[PDB]
């Protein structure tokens, strides 16, 4: 989670970075109870069910927009950031988290590499990117390499002075997206053991013997897990 939820962020909304998270246990309780983030908006996911739900793929997108346009990274939102830069139709029941980057933006005035796609011919497709420096032209005269009164530039930087801001000041938005393909889902999440104290119902891993437990001495192979002495009745477990 830290690889994305916590790193120096030079990512810009114009070229957002995506990460494939899989083959790992996923504890979301740490993110939910962190209270180190300004927002944790979640749509079609329940906070209790987030750990319970298992997912084939986990995709995390990291980008930096001003405080005012954090709202635009949401389903059914219209604005320069959502249409031209980063778009979420439903977010696939994903969760959007914002952390203030004003502390990250050190110095009296650093624009870094943050840029906004003000000029784009059309609206992007869900989870799509755009990195064309192609001059907008915005006129009958075709703009090539030479600059023109109408050539302009598609990307414009954002000034992040520490003083004031708040709206101009950016909360880095990291979007989570969990999809469910045919491939098996391993993305999800014990008590003390009393032996012979009393008859106790139980579930070790998938079985429910509901019988008193005692110390055994039977020889047992390594790769094996449990034993069925007769009539497919489970007598011993490891």
């Amino acid at each position, epitope marked *: 989670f830290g690889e994305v939820f916590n790193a120096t962020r030079f990512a810009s909304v114009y070229a957002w970075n995506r990460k494939r998270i899989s083959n790992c246990v996923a504890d979301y309780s740490v993110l939910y109870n962190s209270a180190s983030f300004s927002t944790f908006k979640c749509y079609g996911v329940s906070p209790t069910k987030l750990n319970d739900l298992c997912f084939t793929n986990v995709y995390a997108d990291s980008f930096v927009i001003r405080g005012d346009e954090v709202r635009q990274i949401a389903p059914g939102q219209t604005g320069k950031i959502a249409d031209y830069n980063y778009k979420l139709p439903d977010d696939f029941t994903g969760c959007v988290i914002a952390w203030n980057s004003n502390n990250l933006d050190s110095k009296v005035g650093g624009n870094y590499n943050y840029l906004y796609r003000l000029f*784009r011919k059309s609206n992007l497709k869900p989870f799509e990117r755009d990195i064309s420096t192609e001059i907008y032209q915005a006129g009958s005269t075709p703009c090539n390499g030479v600059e023109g009164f109408n050539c302009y530039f598609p990307l414009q930087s954002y000034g992040f002075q520490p003083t004031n801001g708040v709206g101009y000041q950016p909360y880095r938005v990291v979007v989570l997206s969990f999809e469910l393909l045919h491939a098996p889902a391993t993305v999800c999440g014990k008590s003390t053991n009393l032996v012979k104290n009393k008859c106790v119902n139980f579930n070790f891993n998938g079985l429910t013997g509901t019988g008193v437990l005692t110390e055994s001495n039977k020889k047992f192979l390594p790769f094996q897990q449990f034993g069925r002495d007769i009539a497919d009745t489970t007598d011993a477990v490891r």
Partner: antibody, heavy 117, light 110 residues
Framework: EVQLVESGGGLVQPGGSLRLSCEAS????????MNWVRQAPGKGLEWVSI???????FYADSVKGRFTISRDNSKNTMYLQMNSLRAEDTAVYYC???????????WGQGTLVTVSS | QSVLTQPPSVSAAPGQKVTISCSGS????????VSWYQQLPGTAPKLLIY???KRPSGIPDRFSGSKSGTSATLGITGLQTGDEADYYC???????????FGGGTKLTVL
């Protein structure tokens, strides 16, 4: 040379439907962010609607619902249609080109829309 | 709709610098760029200030502007007969998503 030509403002009664058109040279209407702004006689400018290049439409709560807008790529024209005409509507409407939200440039002479008995 | 406050009139003799100040809030002026537009009587307004301090191409000199946080001021060394006109200040209001323009200041070259 960029030019702006507009017509369609006329005497009308309240609740009426009226349309405006704006014509431009050297600038493509769809590619360029376009705006519609109005001035009541001897009164401060009031912004009405902006159309983003992809197709986003934003309006003002004062003119919300009563006003409507579209841009036609084939005719290279921007259209402002206004229903539910009100006492306030009387003004000269100037179509304008904006560098995103940074600033408005190339204002047009506009046409006087008059609503009265 | 929040409206920026503008001085109702500013009058000076020729050869005197003139300052016009646009009142503002973080929701509008504090977080977004401000521009000044000059409308002669009977003409559509022409952009006077390109972006905060910046000046657009095609604009006479002696015209300069300063964004002092919430409020932005416009400075004009000398008041020539042409300078007399109406000036307006505009910025995007993030919360209501509307350009906000002040009523205007009627400059009178005396």
């Amino acid at each position: 040379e960029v030019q702006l030509v507009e017509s369609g403002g006329g005497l009308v009664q309240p609740g009426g439907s009226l349309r405006l058109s704006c014509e431009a040279s050297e600038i493509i209407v769809n590619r360029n962010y376009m705006n519609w702004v109005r001035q009541a006689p001897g009164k401060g400018l009031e912004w009405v609607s902006i159309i983003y290049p992809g197709g986003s439409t934003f309006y003002a709560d004062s003119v919300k619902g009563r006003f409507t807008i579209s841009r036609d790529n084939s005719k290279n024209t921007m259209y402002l249609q206004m229903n539910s005409l009100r006492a306030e509507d009387t003004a000269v409407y100037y179509c304008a080109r904006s560098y995103g939200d940074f600033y408005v440039d190339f204002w047009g002479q506009g046409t006087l829309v008059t609503v009265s008995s | 709709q929040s409206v920026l406050t503008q001085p109702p009139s500013v009058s000076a003799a020729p050869g005197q610098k003139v300052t016009i100040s646009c009142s503002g809030s973080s929701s509008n002026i504090g977080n977004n760029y401000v521009s000044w537009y000059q409308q002669l009587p009977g003409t559509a307004p022409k952009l006077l200030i390109y972006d905060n301090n910046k000046r657009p191409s095609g604009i006479p000199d002696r015209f300069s502007g300063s964004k002092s946080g919430t409020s932005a001021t416009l400075g004009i060394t000398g008041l020539q007969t042409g300078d007399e006109a109406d000036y307006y200040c505009g910025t995007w209001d993030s919360s209501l998503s509307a350009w906000v323009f002040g009523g205007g200041t009627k400059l009178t070259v005396l």
